[PDB]
Design a protein around this ligand. Structure first.
Ligand SMILES: *[C@@H]1O[C@H](CO)[C@@H](O[C@@H]2O[C@H](CO)[C@@H](O)[C@H](O)[C@H]2NC(C)=O)[C@H](O)[C@H]1NC(C)=O
Ligand SMILES: *[C@@H]1O[C@H](CO)[C@@H](O[C@@H]2O[C@H](CO)[C@@H](O)[C@H](O)[C@H]2NC(C)=O)[C@H](O)[C@H]1NC(C)=O
Ligand SMILES: *[C@@H]1O[C@H](CO)[C@@H](O[C@@H]2O[C@H](CO)[C@@H](O)[C@H](O)[C@H]2NC(C)=O)[C@H](O)[C@H]1NC(C)=O
Ligand code: NAG
Ligand code: NAG
Ligand code: NAG
Ligand code: NAG
Ligand code: NAG
Ligand code: NAG
Lengths: 318, 169, 169, 318, 169, 318
């Protein structure tokens, strides 16, 4: 008569690593590193906007591409590679800092700044901003002299933020293809634009000159921005080459922005994104994308790290 | 046609538990799983699993741009920082799993010993170790007796005379 | 009115040590703490504590500003780096304590076994395990005899005849 | 006769975590995460200066608020929220880098740069820098033309650092409310300021224009700085709108700076600070402030991580 | 002129192995190393070593300049990040070695116990523990008998009568 | 008759640390922290260039010191402290970003940009660039008016990158010691230089003024650069003070750059470098240099961390 103590075992053993051994067989194991990607943006539960051809910074200035998004609202914001912030060729100064701000803004609320003009044209337009016909940035006014080569009057415009949130203010400096063109638009002489706040002081001079044709145009409009504190005032002093704002922007609340090249899905629910889709996993680590954002498992180099969920496998003596 | 326990070989037939009993008497051979030892091991392993599921509430946002590349200097600083942090987590991950796996294996070996030592203490002076994880029982142990050992209702006092006799000569 | 040792239950009355002895003889019941096993455990635990007190000599200075907020881009890079480093230390802290606690518990269980096994080796063939962490002594063991076991001055040769007699019949 | 082996136990058991269990009871445990804050700045042993209304950058230029600190010395430097670097409205370029430098300077030693002027006023003053009457920055000279609208002579001033430590040099560009005011102060025509070193080259043009009134004033003075290497020379070329330095600064030694809103205590001895006070602890971690500075335990998210200092607690069978 | 095993003292003369046997019989005293236990320990330790040799393929490049110092603000951010990362690796290194060393020591103690327990199971009822890591053999065990124990060819059935006799009286 | 089980031990025991003990003796241990430095740059297998007196940025513009390296090729690039990017006093804007780019370029391929000039001198030279006699940057053209004080014609030059890799383009702005000297070289009036791409827009005005003498000269040439995308064009509009490029640069492939002050060795094979030499080690950590680059063990604070390679040492009872 005999009684033996034993433990189970299999022929289906899987190898893992320990402090000592490499490839020690255990009875059962599970993966800790996620590699399974969902090639969609799972947006269920999240108010989602697909900017498409609209560049994120364009939502503030308003090229034709962004007409739908001038006061957009979102929990999840998606930039696309085809997106463009611009109709008339140019770029923002400190663009990326501004993008990062808008990605978590929750969208924007626009409000008129109430600038009035006299002895001056405001209908500056271009073929590059076609909206039915030639037009311009929807939130901006392209100011000219009045006739041609005529002198541009020195002007001063101010705006106080009477709200409880900071106001996003944007203006543009126009760089003509030639001093001849600058003169034709704003008159002769040097041109100066000053922007004053109570925590901000900057200055701007235009730079006329030949540049490569972009959208058929060799002129550039570069945009500038500041955040205006509550009850603070911005003042604009200028005498030409100034792209004035018509409305200011106010951040709605909270959101998250991503850059992606895959479709959206409002059926799937997710919380960790990358340009290739959504990572839904309870696993502590992932090997899909290091730049993934949201609430994510930590990115690792290894594609697989097996965690033993069973004892060491010891084959039965046959 | 002998039977053997842990110590050179597991049992591929023990399919209703992790740890178990295997006996042979006049009634033949049998195998049953021990609940308490198996459940202890499963509770500890699942305990590890849940601990590794505890999600983080830290949210991270974009710090650079893969459509419009950021400025070189700040971009290289960012890449250098991210790659540095990735090395750290890659190391942490590797070490965590290796450490946990070593522990999973060891506590499993531990449970096997605790079961063996328990049975040894039940049988007292009525048995001897054969050296393969089994006990040679020096008295008649029918299926009812074998079952009594498995549920800790075995009273060694009942078989002690009979057993000590057979052990000594 | 029985007594029991480790294996299902500790002793809330053992208040002068971590590990100890509890006996019953004709003189009655008694409990005393073992110094060597208790001091080993305390030395190892305090050893852990001191290791975690070893202060760092790395000094850190302000890298941003909470009165006049720094520039957005460099500020977000800084926040992203700090939060990343915080996740790392939060993980390290969690893992360290969990790991140390598992070890503290295990080495404590280990000391208990070493004490039990030592006593088992002192008593040789003059005793049997009852299965609750106790030894049934098969000879007369008065308070002086019980004390001799506690300070390792117990000579099993002296009681062996008397004990083996009572064990065999 | 019977002898049993056992271990102690309590009813006062405290829960901890392990690799496997969550809330396993042990006999005794201790905290590893500090949460106990001392709402003071423990300064015993440390030479401490409480800048108060003086902004740290103000110690270099010298508004009335910083008159006590023009050559201050410290081991521990404390900025306050009410602090201001400025009397006449303006700000530093690269302000934060300069603050970080001064926080560990050990204070400053001032030395005359020895600039002499002719055909020019140097007594530029303002109501915003009231010191008894109207005045100016103590370490700076506000240069004017001579009468009003009069031409400002082109000037060139140089200064060699004859010491073994780098010299902190500061100058200012004045931005008038209008070109009319700029002309009234420095004469007509464009204005240029050039600053040359042997590792530094920069240039500056003023930007007259209307700005919001700060301290009743719509003009701005923005300050610039460089570090002058030993035996190297700085040269200033200018023709107006230039706020000249009178003295240079030299760093004294070593210190640490903090920003705080709680009182100072010279009785308590500390080495880890945050805006809310001092963390004195032998514990490896803390959950008080992530931005704490000095010699500190590492900041963690968790408020509590209990370390077992005793064996597993197993209740006695009753 | 007694011999003793593990439990208060190692053997500075065991120079051809980590674990071993030491006997005394009428033929005298002898010491030999056990291969299987020694090789197990060496394999596990070298296994640790190789694991720590696994080189990284991550390449890092210069992010600042020690001839022409970079701008102050970005330079302080870089230094703060590097020093932070250094604290992390310094901690990781310290913890890794301490953890591995604790494990190396423990698995080594484990191998010693497994060897001792194996021998105990070979000798069955023909021997008793002396309490110093040795076995008093209650029969004649010449060099050939001692060698049979070392290579697990010892049949306790052969000496059981002779041994049980000497044990009981 | 007796058989004992035991383990080996020594008197040559070495102390290590564990979770619990500090200085517990084990039988054998090994170091995990490398401290052994090879005071050479082990370059075997790597194509190595020792720039010496040539500054890395100088390889693009071409002072006499870099004449050997104008189209250099390397796997390993070594900057030296004596290196200089400059003959005529000046510096690059965004210098470090450019260095980081060149360190991993694999060297540079130069290609003519094909600019032609009329009504203008191109033989601008200086005593500071002595190459046999007075000369200039090898890859650049110092443009003047024609005679002296003569008017500099407005010019516009463009260049398209017809290759598949981005082109490195460099130009310089010259800052004269005085407006008198600026006029002597480029004529009277304000001077403007505009640089236009399809992703880049910048502008430049010279800043004449007295500066400290460097190499006997008080003028400064500061260099600017951009990366030109394939099929994109850069356009230069200017009327003086412009240092024009003659050739563009193309990155060859892949390399690594280091800064060092020790000799080179083509016999030793290495992969981890610092300014003091090469770290060759299988050890996981090192305590030599935190800023070491290449493929390296991780830097740590501790000089020694001993790993037990043997059991606990227990002395024999004598
Ligand atoms: C092998 O391990 C896996 C992982 O633990 C086990 O699968 C789990 O099963 C439980 C209950 O059936 C589920 O709650 C888990 O979600 C499963 N995990 C995964 C990753 O699928 C599996 O049961 C184990 N094998 C055996 C035979 O028990
Ligand atoms: C429970 O654990 C704490 C922490 O180790 C013990 O308190 C320590 O006591 C020693 C000596 O009395 C002091 O040197 C430590 O500074 C104390 N630590 C703390 C955090 O106060 C305490 O003794 C333990 N409980 C018992 C009953 O021993
Ligand atoms: C002490 O430990 C060292 C380190 O493991 C041992 O030296 C190793 O020896 C093996 C084979 O001889 C080599 O492959 C390793 O490269 C050696 N390592 C080092 C760092 O030199 C040494 O053998 C150990 N001592 C004894 C007595 O075995
Ligand atoms: C708001 O601005 C006005 C002037 O624009 C100023 O007098 C006032 O102090 C500010 N704050 C409040 C709360 O009114
Ligand atoms: C950062 O890393 C990505 C991924 O390799 C690379 O494409 C990008 O160019 C890097 N950033 C910079 C500024 O080089
Ligand atoms: C950095 O984090 C702090 C704490 O939440 C926040 O107040 C601050 O705005 C952040 N910095 C930037 C630039 O957003
Ligand atoms: C100091 O400066 C002078 C000129 O200002 C220069 O000639 C000299 O080489 C410099 N160094 C020393 C050590 O004098
Ligand atoms: C970074 O650290 C090094 C090493 O101490 C130091 O020399 C350097 O000055 C630091 N960088 C800055 C910008 O202070
Ligand atoms: C190249 O540039 C030309 C004009 O310079 C443009 O028309 C063309 O689309 C560009 N791309 C290709 C592939 O030719």
């Amino acid at each position: 008569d005999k009684i033996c103590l034993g433990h189970h075992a299999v022929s289906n053993g899987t190898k893992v690593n320990t402090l000592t051994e490499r490839g020690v067989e255990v009875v059962n194991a599970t993966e800790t590193v996620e590699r399974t990607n969902i090639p969609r943006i799972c947006s269920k539960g999240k108010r989602t906007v697909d900017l498409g051809q609209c560049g994120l910074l364009g939502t503030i200035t308003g090229p034709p591409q962004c007409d739908q998004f001038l006061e957009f609202s979102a929990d999840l914001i998606i930039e696309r590679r085809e997106g463009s912030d611009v109709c008339y060729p140019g770029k923002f100064v400190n663009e990326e800092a501004l993008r990062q701000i808008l990605r978590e803004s929750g969208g924007i609320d626009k409000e008129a700044m109430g600038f009035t003009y006299s002895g001056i044209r405001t209908n500056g337009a271009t073929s590059a901003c076609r909206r039915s016909g030639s037009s311009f940035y929807a939130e901006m006014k392209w100011l000219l002299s009045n006739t041609d080569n005529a002198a541009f009057p020195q002007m001063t415009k101010s705006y106080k933020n009477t709200r409880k949130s900071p106001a996003l203010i944007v203006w543009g400096i126009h760089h003509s293809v030639s001093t001849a063109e600058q003169t034709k638009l704003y008159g002769s002489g040097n041109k100066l634009v000053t922007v004053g706040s109570s925590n901000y002081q900057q200055s701007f001079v235009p730079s006329p000159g030949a540049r490569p044709q972009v959208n058929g145009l060799s002129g550039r409009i570069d945009f500038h921005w500041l955040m205006l504190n509550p009850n603070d005032t911005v003042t604009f002093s200028f005498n030409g080459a100034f792209i004035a704002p018509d409305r200011a922007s106010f951040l709605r609340g909270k959101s998250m922005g991503i850059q992606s090249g895959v479709q959206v899905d409002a059926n799937c629910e997710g919380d960790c994104y990358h340009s290739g889709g959504t990572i839904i996993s309870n696993l502590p680590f992932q090997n899909i994308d290091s730049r993934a954002v949201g609430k994510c498992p930590r990115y690792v180099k290894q594609r697989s790290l097996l965690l033993a969920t069973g004892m060491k496998n010891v084959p039965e003596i046959p | 046609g002998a039977i053997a326990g842990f110590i050179e070989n597991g049992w591929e037939g023990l399919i209703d538990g992790w740890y178990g009993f295997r006996h042979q008497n006049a009634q033949g051979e049998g195998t049953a799983a021990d609940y308490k030892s198996t459940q202890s091991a499963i509770d500890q392993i699942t305990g590890k699993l849940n601990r590794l599921i505890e999600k983080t509430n830290q949210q991270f946002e974009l710090i650079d741009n893969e459509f419009n590349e950021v400025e070189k200097q700040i971009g290289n600083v960012i890449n250098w920082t991210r790659d540095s942090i990735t090395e750290v987590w890659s190391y942490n991950a590797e070490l965590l799993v290796a450490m946990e796996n070593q522990h999973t294996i060891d506590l499993a070996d531990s449970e096997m010993d605790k079961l063996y030592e328990r049975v040894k203490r039940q049988l007292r002076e009525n048995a001897e170790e054969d050296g393969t994880g089994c006990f040679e029982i020096f008295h008649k142990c029918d299926d009812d007796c074998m079952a009594s050992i498995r549920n800790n209702t075995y009273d060694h006092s009942k078989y002690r005379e009979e057993a000590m006799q057979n052990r000594i000569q």
